[PDB]
Design a binder for this molecule. Structure first.
Ligand SMILES: [N]S(=O)(=O)[C][C][C][C+2]123B4[B@@]15[B@]16B7[B@]89B1[C+]651B5[B@]8([B@@]512)B7493
Ligand SMILES: [Zn+2]
Length: 257
């Protein structure tokens, strides 16, 4: 089964998922000087006031916080998008040390981690149908740098000891994802893919320019998670990021000058 190690990591994924070598794979390097400002792009609309978090889960590749997506309670609209996208979950990618961990890069710079808020287009009715469509998903990507603590992340950090190993989950109600967002919604956007198997080419990427700051103590708690199940040899959940993929025939657009 796939992972992030030497014998099952990103360089192997194309054998089970041949679209890994496709025309619109993610992540990519964002070359800031080449991205074109597009004055036709709209401000992004993030409407998270009625969000309902359900559970926190260690899936053996990241941890995720899952939301109720049975109604339009936490939705993304506007920006580059047509129609309405429901929040399903958020998760992170991070490194073994602070100089790597992000999936997207900015002028080849790697951040310590990257937050992904995963949304699906309501016009396809469920996420399984949405992944089969070129405009099925919108993923909001936010970079994390290490410095001051992010207060709105601490509730997440404090329960990670209860989901150490693959399989494990816990109740995680009343969590407000607005506390994870930077000041500015200035963004880059391009057509791409899921960054994990099945690597489906179904995502409109929206990558915020402004990182959030988290503390060293917060990120160290991410690095105590395990890729393994309880009882199996202990392998730290670190370096769970796919490297930048070829841009090929795509344009990255900027919402800002
Ligand atoms: N890094 S990423 O591109 O946000 C992929 C996150 C993982 C996903 B599998 B879990 B499963 B498959 B689609 B579906 C859900 B939707 B993403 B969430 B992909
Ligand atoms: Zn992701």
């Amino acid at each position: 089964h796939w992972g992030y190690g030497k014998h099952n990591g990103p360089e192997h994924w194309h054998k089970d998922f041949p679209i890994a070598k496709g025309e619109r794979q993610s992540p990519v390097d964002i070359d800031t000087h080449t991205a074109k400002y597009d004055p036709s792009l709209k401000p992004l609309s993030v409407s998270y006031d009625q969000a309902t978090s359900l559970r926190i889960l260690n899936n053996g590749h990241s941890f995720q916080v899952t939301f109720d997506d049975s109604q339009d309670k936490a939705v993304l609209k506007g920006g580059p998008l047509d129609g309405t996208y429901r929040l399903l979950q958020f998760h992170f990618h991070w490194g073994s040390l602070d100089g790597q961990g992000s999936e997207h890069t900015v002028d080849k710079k790697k951040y310590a981690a990257e937050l992904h808020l995963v949304h699906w287009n309501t016009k396809y009715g469920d996420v399984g149908k949405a992944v089969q469509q070129p405009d099925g998903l919108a993923v909001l990507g936010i970079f994390l740098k290490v410095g001051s603590a992010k207060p709105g992340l601490q509730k997440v950090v404090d329960v990670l000891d209860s989901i150490k190993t693959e399989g494990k989950s816990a109740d995680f109600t009343n969590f407000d994802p607005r506390g994870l967002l930077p000041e500015s919604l200035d963004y880059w956007t391009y057509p791409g893919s899921l960054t994990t198997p099945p690597l489906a080419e179904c995502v409109t990427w929206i990558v915020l320019k402004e990182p959030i700051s988290v503390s060293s103590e917060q990120v160290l708690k991410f690095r105590k998670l395990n890729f393994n199940g309880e009882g199996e040899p202990e392998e730290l959940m670190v370096d769970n990021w796919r490297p930048a993929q070829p841009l090929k025939n795509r344009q990255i657009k900027a919402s800002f000058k």
